[PDB]
Design a protein around this ligand. Structure first.
Ligand SMILES: Nc1ncnc2c1ncn2[C@@H]1O[C@H](COP(=O)(O)OP(=O)(O)OP(=O)(O)O)[C@@H](O)[C@H]1O
Ligand SMILES: Nc1ncnc2c1ncn2[C@@H]1O[C@H](COP(=O)(O)OP(=O)(O)O)[C@@H](O)[C@H]1O
Lengths: 1010, 96, 848
C-alpha cells in the first residue's frame, strides 16, 4: 500500500504504510502502526528501510500478541491477529501450559498435567469448531487450517508426554516457542539450540501435517545448525523434503529462498545465491540438488567449505572463493539440499560436500496422521479413532478388491472423501461422527465398484464399523417415482432393481460434480441410462439434451481447433463450437456433452482445465470460454485404462457392470417389444422357448466351456443381441403375412438363430462339439444326414417349415467365361447370402443396426461371398459401394469417401443418389493401425457412423454440426484375430452381427461345374 | 499402393473425373463385343466394373523381395494380400 | 597371451581396471630381460614364465580393489589351465554353478539328515560330470560313498578347515593326477562347505601358480613412484572414505617436493590446472589432482598435454586421485599407472585410522575432563564396530549405509557442546545424562538409516556401549577368547596422551571374533559364504559366451536340454473360468458351523487372487521356455528378452523376465538359483492346487509359498474378527486388532491333526543367527545356520513389555523393509535379554 506523505513540504514523494500478501481475490493486511516507510529517491536505501520496518512491526505486534493470548479466549484471539502471529501465539500458549504443568509435577502437585491437557483439548475443540463456521476467503481458510495442523501435534505430544520434570529429555525434544520477559525477544528452542524468531512476514501459508518422524527431523536439522554443519534431507519423491525445511523456517519466522536446481546451473549461478544467503542472514534450501552436474558440486563444495570455516570461528567477514574483498556474514545462515537417493538425476555428492551437510533420511509420511489432521481441519472430533478406521479400510480394500484402473485408494480419493465428509458434517453437527464418515465413504465408492467387488466392500465396511448396524441412503423420492413411469413409454425397456439403482447413482453424481463419467463393458446399457435419466429430468422442471460425439473419431487438432498453416486464419474446433453453443444461459437447456470414444492421454489434456474446479476451456489462441451452471460433460468410456490417475480423480465415475442390465433383461425387453408391435400370441410362445434355452439352462455359459478357441472373443450379451437380431429376421416374413406358428416351428427357428449367433464364430472342429451339445439338451436338429453333418448346413424354410439341407442355386454359365473373373454359387456363399439377407432386410431397431461383419481365415472366400450377395441388386432399388481399409487408412480418408458417395439430401438428413439404401462393404476391417493405447481411430468413426447414423463435418466453414446418412447398411470382412493381426474394438463388435466363414470340406461343388 | 492395387483392382481418386469418360469411351467397343455381342451403349458405372476387371487381367505385379531383410517379415503382417494374393516362387540356394 | 586375455576379462568386472595391449607388451618385454639367464634352453623358458606371471599379476593386482583381488588371480589360474587339456570350459562352468541348476523333484531324493538340500544337489552335479581327459565321471558313486554309514564323511563336513584336511574316501585317487587333481579337490569343497571356497582357491592357486601369488604384496608408495616416469602419470583409484594425498606429501618430503601444487578438479579448474602443470613441466615438482572423475573434460585433455610432444622435466611426476567412475576416458587409463588405496577394514585397523587422523592431541584436550576422553574412545570404538557389521551383509545391516568420519566428528562435536554446559557448573564425574546421549548419537548416525529395523538395531548398540558404567575403570565391553582372552577395554590415561590410545590399539587382535558385534561364532560362516558367492558372481559375468564348451555338447545344446526338462515339470495352465467354479465351492474357516461359501470369504478371495497371479507367472515361464527352444533351432528370430533368458538358463540364474516385469514390480518370488526357483514353483503351485481342487484348506499353511503373505495374514485377521462380532462386551474391528503369535513346541509336526479354532498354523519359517530350544530362544549350534522353527500359531488378540523379543519375519534373507511381513513375540524367558538377540540379528526367514 502506498500513501500520500509530506504533502505540505517536499511533496510527490510517497509513503508506504501497509504490507499485502494476496492469495486469489482475498488478502492478509498487516498495517505498520507507526514505523511508516518514507521511500527516499535511491531505491536500495528505502528497500533496506522497508525490510527493517516490517521486521520491527511484527516484533512489536507479536510482542503485544504474546501478552494478549494468555488473557483472551482462543476463538477471539486468532480472529483479531494476522496468520503468522496467530500460529506463534498458539504455539507460545501451548508451551507455557506444558512448562507450567511440568513445573507443578516436579513440586509434587498431583494431576497438574491432567488439568493442563484438559485446557489444551478445549483449545483444540475451539479450532476444530472454527473450521465448521466456514469463514469467507482463501487466506482465513489457510490461517485456521495451519493452526489446526499444529494444534493436533501439540495435543498428540502433550497427551502422551509423561515427564516428571521440565529438564527431562522427552520434553526438550519437542519444538518449544516461549516469550522471555528478561531479554524482551521471542526464542524458539529445539533440544539445546535457541534461535531468536527472525520476524520475516510470511502471511497465511499452507503448513504440512507434523508426523513423529518430522519432529525427529527438525531436531537433526536444528543440531546441524548449532554445530554449523549444513543440513541435507534425502528421501524418495513426494515426502516433501523441501516443504519440511520450509516448515521449520516458517516455524522460526525466517524467509526461505527455494532455488529449483538443474543441469543448466553453473558454479557462478550457485555462487551468487550463497553470497546472497551469508549477506542477508536468510536460509536457502536447494530443490533437487543431486540434479546439479557433478563438475559444479566440487566448486560449490569449496564455497560451502569456506562459508562453514567462517561460521565455526564466528568470523564477522570472510573471503569467499573467486571474490577479491571480505564479505559480511550474518550468524543465522542455514543452507540445505533436498536430494533423492535411488537418484532419477546424477551420481552421489562429492567427498568434500558429504562432510558439510548432516543427512536426515525421510520415509513416506504415515497416511493415518495426514487423514487425522484433515478430519480435524474439517471440524470432526475424536479424529485419532476415525483416522485409523478410515486408513485401515482404504489400505485393506486396495489389496482385497480387483485391481481395476477407475479404483483409486491413494490420498487423491481420500482428500476428495474428506471435503464431502466435511460438507456433510457442517449441515448435521448433531449426527454421530462415525456414521457421517461411514456414509460419506459408502455413497462415493459404491458407484465406482464392479458387481464382483460390492459384496467384498460391504464386508470390509461392516468389519471396521460393527457399531453402525445400518445407514439410510438419500431417498430421492421425485426421480425414483418417474423412472418406472418413463421406462413403460418405450416398448423395448424393462425395469430391474439393479438397473434402476445404477440410474439413481448416475443422478447422485450428476448433482454434485459437472464431469461425471459412465464406465462399463459393451452393451451394459450405459447409452440407455444416459437417455432415461435425461428423459426423467426433462419431465421434472428443466429439459436435458445429450450431444454424442466421438473424440477418437477426429484428430486432437481438428476436435479443439488449431491455427491453419495456409492463410494464417483460425479454424473453429468441433468441441469448442459444441461447447460454445452448449454454454449459454438461455431457456434452461442444460445440455450434456458426451465423449463416447475411449479416454487417452492425448485428447483429454487440452480438456483437463474444464474437468477441474476452474471450469474454463482453453483453445490455446488466448481465448478462454467459461462453463455455465447448466452445461455438463460426460464420458461413455468402456475401460478407462489408458488415462493418467490424476484426470480420473477429477471426474465422478459410475460403473455399470454386465449383471446390472443382464442379457435376460434385454431378451425380456425384446419380447415386451414384440407384444407392442401388435403380435402378442407369437411373443407369448417365443418367451416360453427363449427362457428354456437361455435363462433356465445357461446355454451361453455351457457352450463357452465345451467349445475352445472361439475365433473372435465376444461377451455373452453380444451373442444374445445377435440371437434376437437373427430370430427377428427369420420371423420378419411371418410378420407381413400375419401368420402365427406352432411352438415346434418357432423352436426350430430359435435353435437355427442360436446356432449361428452363438456358434457362428467357432471353427469346423468346434461346430461339431456345438452340434453335439444341442443333441444332449433335446433341441430339434436334422435327424438324418451324412458323416460330419452339422446344424449349420441346414436352415428353416419359409414356405414349408422343417430342416432342409441348403443346396446352392444351380450355376448358369455367364456366356464367355474367364476362369479369373468367374464366381459361382457355393455352399459357403449361400449360407453367407442367407444370414446377410436376414440382418440387412430387417427394419432399424434398438437391437440391430442393419450391419453384418463376417470374420474368417485368409482367403476363405469372405470378399467373394459378399460380392456375390451385392450382385442381384436392382440399380434403382439398392446401390453398392466398396471401400478397402488398410494400415494407412485414417478416419478422414474413410469419412471423405462415404461423405462423397451419398450427397443427395432430405432437409437436414443426407442419403445416397435418389433413395437407394446403399450398402457400404468394408473389406479387411481389422487392418487400420492400432496405437500404443490399443484403440483403432478410424474404426471408432465406423462405430460412431453405424450407431448414431452420423459424424461431424470437418470442412473449415461448418464445425459442430452433425451430418446424418438416413439409409445405409454395412457389411464387414476381416481376417480373424490372433497371430499379430488387429482385433476389432469390443464396443464396435456389438453393432455388427458376426459369423465365421470356413474352408469347404469338398470344393467339388465349386470347381466341378467349371 | 501396389498392395491396394492388387486386392481392389483400382486406386481411389487416381485419375481426373473427366479423364474417366475419355478412357471408358475407347473401352466400350471391346466391352459390348466381349459380353456375348451385347451391342448396346453402356452406362458409365457398368463400364467402370469391366475396365477394372480388364486392368487386373492385363496388369501383372512382379515383387522381388529378400527373406533375410527384417522389413520383409513386417511387410507381410502390415500389407495383407501382398503375400496371400500373388503366387510365391521361393529361390533356394544354388545346387551343385 | 593367456595372461593378456585375463586382463581383458578383468575389464568386464570394472571399467577402471582395463589396461591397454601396449601397457602389457612393456611388462612382457621387461619380464624377459629381468628374468634369470639359464644356459639350458628349457630352464631359460621355465624362468621367464614363473617371472612373467608374477610380474604381470603384481602390476594388475595394484589397480584392483580388495574384493576383486582374489577373483582376478582365480580367472588367471583357470585361463592358464583352460589353454592346456587339464580344464575344459565345462569344468570352470561346473565350479561356478555346482548343480544349483538341478531341481530335487526331477533328481534322486536326499536320503541323508546331516547334508542340506543344496549340498545334495551340489554332490549330484559332481556325480554326472566327466571333467577333461577322463572316460567316466571321477565323482560317479560319490553319493553312494557319502550315503554309506562312515563317520569319516560327516567328520570332514563338520571340520573348521575342510579343504586343509584330505578327502575321507577319495583322497588317494586325487593325489595321482597332479595337474587336474588340485581343481577336482577344489570343486568337492565348493559343493560341500561352500563357505570355505576363498580359502580353498588359495590352496588351488598355490599348486597351479606357486606360493608367492597367495602372499599379500602391499606395494609401498616409494615402489609406485620408482615404477612411474615423467610421461606416465600415477592414477589412484579411491574407494569412498580413502585419501592418499597425505601419503604423496610424505614421500615428497624424502624427495624434497613437500611444498607441491594441489588442484581439486571441477568445473572452471581446467584453466588453473593448465597453469600449474606448465610450471611443473619445466621447473620440476609434483602435481596432485583430487576428485578428477568430476572434471572429466580435462582428463581427455591431460592425456595429450602430459604426452612426450610437450617438453617435460625428468623430476616432474603427475599424481591423479579419483574414485571409480563409468565413462572415464579410456585414453588416460591406457597411459597411466593404476593404484587402489582402500581402507584396511579390520576393527584394529579401523580404530587405528581414527586415532591416527581425526582424533589428535588438540582434540582430546578440548573439554579437559576424564569422562570426555573416555566417551571419545566409546564413540570411536562403536563407530569402527558399526562399520565392520556391514561385512556380515543382511545379518549385519538390512541396507549398508557408508558411515563416513563426518558422522563420528558431528557426534563428538555434539558431546563438546553438552559437556561444556556441564563443565561450566560448579567422584568428580559430570551428570552426562546418557538418555540424551543414546538418542543424539542415534540421530547423527540415524540421518543415514532409512530402514525401521536397522534403526532399532543401531539404538540397541547405543544401549550396550553408551551405558552409565563406562566411566568406572572395571568395565570392558566384550571380554572375548580370540587368542587366552583380550579385554577390549576403554584405555585409562591419568594424563591425556594420544600415544597411550594408539599404544593400546596395537595390542588389539588383527582377526575380529564375531562376538565383539554381539553376533554368534556362526556369523563368520555366513560372512565367508557371501564374499565367496560375491567372488563366484563376479567371475560368472566375465565368462566367455563361446558355444564350444567341450565334452561333445555346445552351450546352446546344454540350454536346450534344460529348457526341455523344465517344460515337462511345469504344472498345467489353470483355466480362469474353471478356477472360479472351483473357488465358488470352497468352504470358510470353522467350516462345520460356518455355512458360508464363495468369493465372499476373506481367504477364498485371497486364494483366487494368488491363483490368477500364479497362472500369470506359469504362463510367462511357459511362453519364454518354448521360444528359447525355437530360437536356438532357428525357427524364430532371437528377441532381446529371449537372448537374456538363454544366457541366464546356461548359468542356472533365473531369467530377469521371470523375477521382474518391464515396469519393475515383483511378479514371482526372488531366488538366485533357477533350480531352487523351479522347486519352489512346483511346491508354491502344489499348495494352491491342493487347496483349490480339494474342499479343505491346508492344516499347516506354507507362508513362504504365497505371493502376498502380508495380504494372507490380513486375510486371516478379517476371518477371526467376523467370528467375534457376536462375542462380548466389545465388538471387534480391523481398526484396533493386531496379531497374537505363539510357537507350538511339538516333538512332531504330524501331531497336528485338526486346524486351530481361530488361527492359521504357519510352518517352515527359519531362525537366522539363533535356534529354538523349546525354552524360548537359545544360541545356535556350531556350523548349523538357519535352524528350523516349529509350527507358528497366529491369531487376532484385539489390542487390549520387557523379556519379550519382537522378532521380524522376512519374506527373504535380504531383509529390506519391502520384504518385512510381520513382527512376532518370541518369549526369550531364561538368562538372555531381548536386546542381546537384536545384536545377534535374530529374524524369521520364509525363503532360506
Ligand atoms: N433396461 C433395458 N431393458 C431392455 N433393453 C435394454 C435396456 N437397456 C438397454 N437395452 C437394450 O440393450 C442394448 C444395450 O445398448 P446400450 O447402448 O444401452 O448399452 P451401451 O452400454 O451403451 O453399449 P455400448 O457400450 O456398446 O455403447 C440396446 O439395444 C438397448 O436398447
Ligand atoms: N464361389 C466361388 N467361385 C469362384 N471362386 C471362388 C468362390 N469362392 C471362393 N473363390 C476363390 O477363393 C479365393 C478366396 O479369396 P476371396 O474370396 O477373394 O476373399 P478372402 O481371400 O478375403 O477370403 C478367391 O481367390 C476366389 O477365386
Amino acid at each position: 500500500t502506498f500513501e500520500s506523505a509530506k504533502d505540505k513540504k517536499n511533496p510527490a514523494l510517497k509513503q508506504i504504510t501497509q504490507i499485502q500478501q494476496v492469495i486469489g481475490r482475498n488478502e492478509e493486511n498487516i498495517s505498520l502502526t507507526g514505523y511508516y516507510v518514507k521511500c527516499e529517491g535511491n531505491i536500495e536505501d528505502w528497500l533496506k528501510k522497508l525490510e527493517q520496518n516490517m521486521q520491527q512491526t511484527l516484533k512489536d505486534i507479536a510482542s503485544a500478541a504474546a501478552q494478549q493470548v494468555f488473557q483472551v479466549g482462543l476463538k477471539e484471539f486468532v480472529s483479531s491477529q494476522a496468520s503468522q502471529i496467530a500460529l506463534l501465539g498458539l504455539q507460545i500458549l501451548w508451551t507455557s501450559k506444558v512448562n507450567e504443568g511440568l513445573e507443578r509435577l516436579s513440586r509434587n502437585e498431583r494431576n497438574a498435567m491432567d488439568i493442563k491437557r484438559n485446557e489444551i483439548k478445549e483449545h483444540m475443540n475451539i479450532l476444530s469448531s472454527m473450521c465448521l463456521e466456514d469463514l469467507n476467503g482463501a487466506v482465513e481458510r489457510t490461517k485456521v487450517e495451519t493452526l489446526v495442523t499444529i494444534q493436533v501435534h501439540q495435543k498428540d505430544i502433550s497427551m502422551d508426554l509423561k515427564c516428571k520434570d521440565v529438564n527431562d529429555f522427552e520434553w526438550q525434544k519437542q519444538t518449544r516457542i516461549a516469550w522471555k520477559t528478561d531479554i524482551d525477544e521471542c526464542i524458539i528452542s529445539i533440544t539445546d539450540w535457541d534461535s531468536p524468531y527472525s520476524y520475516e512476514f510470511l502471511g497465511a501459508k499452507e503448513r504440512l501435517c507434523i508426523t513423529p518422524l518430522t519432529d525427529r527431523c527438525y531436531i537433526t536439522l536444528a543440531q546441524a545448525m548449532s554445530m554449523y554443519y549444513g543440513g541435507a534431507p534425502a528421501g524418495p519423491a513426494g515426502t516433501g523434503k523441501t516443504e519440511t525445511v520450509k516448515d521449520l523456517g516458517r516455524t522460526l519466522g525466517v524467509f526461505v529462498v527455494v532455488t529449483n536446481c538443474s543441469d543448466q546451473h553453473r558454479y557462478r549461478d550457485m555462487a551468487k545465491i550463497f553470497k546472497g544467503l551469508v549477506q542477508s542472514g536468510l536460509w536457502g534450501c536447494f530443490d533437487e540438488f543431486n540434479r546439479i552436474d557433478l563438475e559444479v558440486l566440487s566448486v560449490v563444495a569449496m564455497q560451502v567449505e569456506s562459508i562453514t570455516t567462517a561460521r565455526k570461528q564466528h568470523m564477522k567477514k570472510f573471503m569467499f572463493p573467486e571474490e577479491e574483498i571480505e564479505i559480511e556474514l550474518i550468524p543465522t545462515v542455514s543452507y540445505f539440499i533436498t536430494m533423492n537417493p535411488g537418484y532419477a538425476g546424477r551420481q552421489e555428492l562429492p567427498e568434500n560436500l558429504k562432510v558439510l551437510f548432516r543427512g536426515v533420511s525421510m520415509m513416506v509420511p504415515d497416511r493415518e496422521i495426514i487423514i487425522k489432521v484433515k478430519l480435524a481441519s474439517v471440524g470432526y472430533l475424536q479424529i485419532d479413532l476415525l483416522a485409523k478406521k478410515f486408513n485401515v479400510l482404504y489400505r485393506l480394500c486396495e489389496e482385497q478388491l480387483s485391481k481395476q484402473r477407475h479404483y483409486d485408494f491413494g490420498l487423491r480419493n481420500i482428500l476428495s472423501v474428506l471435503r464431502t465428509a466435511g460438507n456433510t458434517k457442517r449441515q448435521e453437527i448433531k449426527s454421530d461422527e462415525e456414521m457421517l464418515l461411514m456414509r460419506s465413504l459408502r455413497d462415493m465408492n459404491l458407484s465406482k465398484l464392479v458387481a464382483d467387488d460390492i459384496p467384498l466392500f460391504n464386508g470390509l465396511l461392516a468389519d471396521i464399523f460393527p457399531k453402525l448396524k445400518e445407514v439410510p441412503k438419500k431417498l430421492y423420492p421425485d426421480v425414483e417415482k418417474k423412472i418406472p413411469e418413463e421406462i413403460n413409454a418405450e416398448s423395448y425397456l424393462i425395469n430391474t432393481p439393479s438397473f434402476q439403482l445404477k440410474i439413481i447413482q448416475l443422478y447422485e453424481t450428476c448433482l454434485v460434480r459437472h464431469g461425471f463419467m459412465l464406465v462399463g463393458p459393451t452393451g451394459s446399457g450405459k447409452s440407455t441410462i444416459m437417455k432415461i435419466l435425461t428423459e426423467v429430468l426433462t419431465k421434472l422442471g428443466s429439459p436435458h439434451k445429450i450431444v454424442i460425439m466421438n473424440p477418437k473419431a477426429i484428430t486432437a487438432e481438428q476436435m479443439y481447433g488449431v491455427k491453419s498453416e495456409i492463410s494464417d486464419d483460425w479454424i473453429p474446433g468441433v468441441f469448442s463450437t459444441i461447447w460454445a453453443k452448449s454454454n449459454n444461459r438461455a431457456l434452461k437447456h442444460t445440455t450434456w456433452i458426451t465423449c463416447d470414444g475411449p479416454v487417452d492421454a492425448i485428447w483429454i489434456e487440452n480438456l483437463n482445465t474444464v474437468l477441474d474446479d476452474n471450469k474454463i476451456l482453453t483453445l490455446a489462441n488466448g481465448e478462454r470460454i467459461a462453463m455455465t451452471e447448466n452445461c455438463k460433460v460426460v464420458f461413455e468410456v468402456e475401460n478407462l485404462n489408458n488415462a493418467s490417475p490424476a484426470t480420473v480423480s477429477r471426474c465422478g465415475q459410475v460403473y455399470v457392470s454386465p449383471t446390472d442390465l443382464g442379457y435376460e433383461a434385454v431378451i425380456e425387453g425384446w419380447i415386451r417389444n414384440r407384444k407392442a408391435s401388435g403380435r402378442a400370441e407369437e411373443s407369448d410362445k417365443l418367451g416360453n422357448i427363449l427362457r428354456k434355452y437361455l435363462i433356465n439352462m445357461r446355454f451361453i455359459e455351457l457352450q463357452s466351456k465345451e467349445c475352445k478357441e472361439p475365433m473372435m472373443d465376444t461377451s455373452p450379451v453380444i451373442s444374445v443381441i445377435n440371437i434376437l437380431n437373427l430370430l427377428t429376421g427369420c420371423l420378419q416374413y411371418f410378420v407381413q403375412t400375419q401368420r402365427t406358428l406352432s411352438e415346434q416351428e418357432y423352436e426350430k427357428f430359435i435353435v437355427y438363430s442360436m446356432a449361428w449367433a452363438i456358434g457362428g464364430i467357432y471353427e469346423a472342429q468346434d461346430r461339431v462339439r456345438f452340434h453335439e451339445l444341442l443333441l444332449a439338451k433335446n433341441a430339434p436338429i436334422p435327424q438324418k444326414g451324412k458323416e460330419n453333418e452339422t446344424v449349420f448346413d441346414y436352415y428353416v424354410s419359409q414356405d414349408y417349415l422343417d430342416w432342409k439341407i441348403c443346396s446352392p442355386e444351380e450355376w448358369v454359365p455367364p456366356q464367355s467365361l474367364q476362369f479369373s473373373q468367374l464366381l459361382l454359387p457355393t455352399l459357403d456363399s449361400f449360407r453367407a447370402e442367407m444370414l446377410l439377407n436376414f440382418i440387412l432386410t430387417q427394419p432399424k431397431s434398438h437391437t440391430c443396426s442393419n450391419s453384418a461383419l463376417l470374420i474368417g481365415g485368409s482367403g476363405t472366400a469372405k470378399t467373394s461371398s459378399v460380392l456375390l450377395y451385392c450382385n442381384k441388386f436392382d440399380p434403382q432399388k439398392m446401390l453398392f459401394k466398396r471401400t478397402n481399409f488398410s494400415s494407412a487408412t485414417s478416419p478422414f480418408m474413410f469419412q471423405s469417401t462415404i461423405e462423397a458417395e451419398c450427397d443427395f439430401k432430405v432437409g437436414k438428413e443426407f442419403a445416397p443418389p435418389g433413395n437407394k439404401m446403399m450398402t457400404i462393404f468394408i473389406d479387411d476391417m481389422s487392418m487400420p493401425f492400432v496405437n500404443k493405447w490399443g484403440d483403432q481411430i478410424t474404426l471408432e468413426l465406423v462405430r460412431q457412423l453405424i450407431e448414431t447414423g452420423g459424424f461431424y463435418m470437418l470442412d473449415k466453414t461448418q464445425r459442430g454440426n452433425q451430418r446424418k446418412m438416413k439409409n445405409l447398411q454395412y457389411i464387414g470382412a476381416m481376417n480373424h484375430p490372433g497371430g499379430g493381426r488387429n482385433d476389432i474394438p469390443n464396443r464396435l463388435k456389438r453393432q455388427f452381427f458376426i459369423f465365421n466363414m470356413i474352408l469347404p470340406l469338398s470344393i467339388e461343388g465349386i470347381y466341378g461345374p467349371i | 499402393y501396389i498392395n491396394m492395387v492388387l486386392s481392389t483392382g483400382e486406386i481411389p481418386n487416381l485419375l481426373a473425373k473427366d479423364e474417366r469418360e475419355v478412357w471408358l469411351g475407347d473401352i466400350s467397343q471391346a466391352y459390348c463385343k466381349e459380353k456375348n455381342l451385347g451391342n448396346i451403349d453402356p452406362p458409365q458405372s457398368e463400364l467402370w466394373t469391366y475396365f477394372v476387371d480388364r486392368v487386373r487381367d492385363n496388369f501383372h505385379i512382379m515383387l522381388c523381395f529378400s527373406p533375410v531383410g527384417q522389413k520383409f517379415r513386417e511387410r507381410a503382417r502390415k500389407f495383407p494380400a501382398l503375400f496371400n494374393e500373388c503366387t510365391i516362387d521361393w529361390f533356394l540356394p544354388w545346387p551343385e | 597371451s593367456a595372461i593378456y586375455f585375463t586382463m581383458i576379462e578383468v575389464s568386464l568386472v570394472n571399467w577402471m581396471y582395463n589396461s591397454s595391449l601396449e601397457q602389457f607388451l612393456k611388462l612382457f618385454i621387461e619380464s624377459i630381460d629381468l628374468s634369470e639367464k639359464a644356459q639350458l634352453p628349457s630352464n631359460r623358458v621355465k624362468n621367464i614364465i614363473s617371472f612373467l606371471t608374477f610380474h604381470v599379476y603384481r602390476y594388475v593386482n595394484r589397480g584392483l580393489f580388495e574384493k576383486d583381488k582374489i577373483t582376478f588371480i582365480l580367472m588367471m589360474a583357470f585361463k592358464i589351465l583352460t589353454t592346456a587339456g587339464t580344464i575344459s570350459s565345462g569344468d570352470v562352468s561346473l565350479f561356478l554353478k555346482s548343480g544349483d541348476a538341478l531341481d530335487i523333484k526331477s533328481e534322486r531324493q536326499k536320503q541323508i539328515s546331516y547334508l542340506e538340500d543344496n549340498q545334495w544337489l551340489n554332490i549330484l552335479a559332481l556325480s554326472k560330470h566327466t571333467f577333461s581327459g577322463q572316460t567316466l565321471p571321477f565323482f560317479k558313486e560319490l553319493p553312494d560313498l557319502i550315503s554309506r554309514s562312515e563317520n569319516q564323511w560327516r567328520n570332514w563336513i563338520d571340520k573348521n578347515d575342510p579343504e586343509n584336511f584330505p578327502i575321507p574316501d577319495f583322497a588317494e585317487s586325487i593325489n595321482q593326477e597332479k595337474e587336474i587333481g588340485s581343481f577336482i579337490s577344489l570343486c568337492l569343497v565348493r559343493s560341500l562347505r561352500n563357505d570355505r571356497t576363498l580359502i580353498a582357491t588359495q590352496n588351488f592357486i598355490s599348486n597351479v601358480l606357486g606360493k608367492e601369488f597367495t602372499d599379500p604384496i602391499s606395494y609401498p608408495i616409494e615402489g609406485i613412484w620408482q615404477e612411474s616416469s615423467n610421461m606416465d602419470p600415477v592414477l589412484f583409484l579411491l574407494s569412498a572414505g580413502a585419501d592418499p594425498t597425505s601419503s604423496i606429501d610424505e614421500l615428497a618430503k624424502k624427495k624434497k617436493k613437500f611444498p607441491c601444487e594441489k588442484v581439486s578438479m571441477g568445473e572452471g579448474q581446467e584453466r588453473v590446472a593448465r597453469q600449474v602443470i606448465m610450471k611443473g613441466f619445466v621447473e620440476g615438482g609434483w602435481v596432485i589432482l583430487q576428485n578428477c572423475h568430476l572434471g572429466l573434460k580435462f582428463m581427455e585433455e591431460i592425456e595429450t598435454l602430459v604426452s612426450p610432444i610437450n617438453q617435460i622435466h625428468e623430476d616432474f611426476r603427475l599424481w591423479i586421485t579419483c574414485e571409480q567412475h563409468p565413462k572415464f576416458p579410456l585414453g588416460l587409463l591406457q597411459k597411466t599407472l593404476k593404484v587402489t588405496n582402500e581402507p584396511p577394514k579390520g576393527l584394529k585397523a579401523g580404530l587405528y585410522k581414527t586415532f591416527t587422523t581425526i582424533i589428535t592431541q588438540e582434540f582430546i584436550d578440548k573439554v579437559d575432563h576424564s569422562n570426555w576422553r573416555s566417551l571419545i574412545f566409546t564413540i570411536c570404538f562403536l563407530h569402527s564396530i558399526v562399520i565392520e557389521r556391514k561385512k556380515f551383509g543382511p545379518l549385519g545391516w538390512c541396507v549398508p549405509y557408508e558411515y563416513n568420519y563426518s558422522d563420528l566428528e558431528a557426534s563428538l562435536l555434539y558431546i563438546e557442546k553438552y559437556l561444556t554446559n556441564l563443565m561450566s557448573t560448579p567422584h568428580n564425574l559430570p551428570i552426562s545424562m546418557n538418555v540424551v546421549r543414546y538418542m543424539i548419537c542415534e540421530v547423527q548416525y540415524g540421518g543415514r538409516i532409512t530402514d525401521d529395523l536397522d534403526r532399532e538395531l543401531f539404538i540397541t548398540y547405543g544401549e550396550t556401549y553408551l551405558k552409565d558404567g563406562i566411566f568406572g575403570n572395571d568395565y570392558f565391553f566384550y571380554d572375548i577368547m580370540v587368542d587366552q582372552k583380550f579385554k577390549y577395554r576403554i584405555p585409562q590415561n591419568p594424563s591425556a596422551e594420544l600415544i597411550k590410545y594408539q599404544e593400546y590399539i596395537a595390542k588389539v587382535p588383527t582377526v575380529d571374533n564375531p562376538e565383539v558385534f554381539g553376533l554368534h561364532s556362526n556369523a563368520d560362516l555366513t560372512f565367508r559364504l557371501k564374499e565367496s558367492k560375491e567372488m563366484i558372481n563376479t567371475v560368472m559375468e566375465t565368462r566367455p559366451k563361446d558355444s564350444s564348451v567341450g565334452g561333445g555338447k555346445t552351450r546352446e545344446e546344454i540350454v536346450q536340454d534344460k529348457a526341455k526338462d523344465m517344460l515337462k515339470n511345469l504344472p498345467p495352465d489353470y483355466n480362469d473360468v474353471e478356477v472360479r467354479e472351483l473357488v465358488s465351492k470352497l468352504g470358510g474357516p470353522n467350516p462345520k458351523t460356518s455355512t458360508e461359501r464363495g468369493m465372499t470369504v476373506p481367504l477364498n478371495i485371497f486364494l483366487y487372487q494368488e491363483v490368477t497371479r500364479m497362472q500369470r507367472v506359469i504362463g510367462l515361464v511357459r511362453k519364454t521356455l518354448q521360444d528359447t527352444i525355437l530360437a536356438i533351432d532357428g525357427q524364430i528370430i532371437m528377441t532381446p528378452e529371449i537372448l537374456e533368458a538363454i544366457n541366464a538358463i546356461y548359468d542356472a540364474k533365473v531369467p530377469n523376465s521371470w523375477l521382474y516385469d518391464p515396469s519393475g514390480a515383483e511378479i514371482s518370488w526372488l531366488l538366485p538359483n533357477l533350480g531352487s526357483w523351479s522347486t519352489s514353483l512346483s511346491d508354491r503351485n502344489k499348495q494352491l492346487n491342493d487347496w483349490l481342487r480339494s474342499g479343505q484348506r491346508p492344516i499347516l499353511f506354507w507362508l513362504t509359498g504365497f505371493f502376498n503373505p502380508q495380504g494372507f495374514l490380513t486375510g486371516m485377521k478379517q476371518e477371526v474378527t467376523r467370528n467375534h462380532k457376536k462375542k462380548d462386551g466389545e465388538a471387534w474391528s480391523l481398526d484396533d486388532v493386531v496379531y497374537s503369535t505363539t510357537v507350538k513346541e511339538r516333538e512332531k509336526e504330524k501331531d497336528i491333526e485338526q486346524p486351530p479354532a481361530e488361527g492359521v498354523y504357519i510352518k517352515g519359517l527359519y531362525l537366522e543367527g539363533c535356534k529354538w530350544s523349546k525354552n524360548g530362544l537359545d544360541d545356535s549350534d556350531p556350523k548349523k545356520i538357519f535352524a528350523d522353527l516349529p509350527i507358528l500359531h497366529v491369531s487376532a488378540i484385539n489390542k487390549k513389555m520387557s523379556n519379550t523379543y519382537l522378532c521380524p519375519v522376512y519374506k527373504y534373507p535380504k531383509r529390506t523393509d519391502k520384504y518385512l511381513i510381520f513382527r512376532v513375540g518370541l518369549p526369550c524367558e531364561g538368562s538372555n535379554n531381548p536386546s542381546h538377540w537384536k545384536l545377534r540379528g535374530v529374524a524369521l526367514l520364509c525363503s532360506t
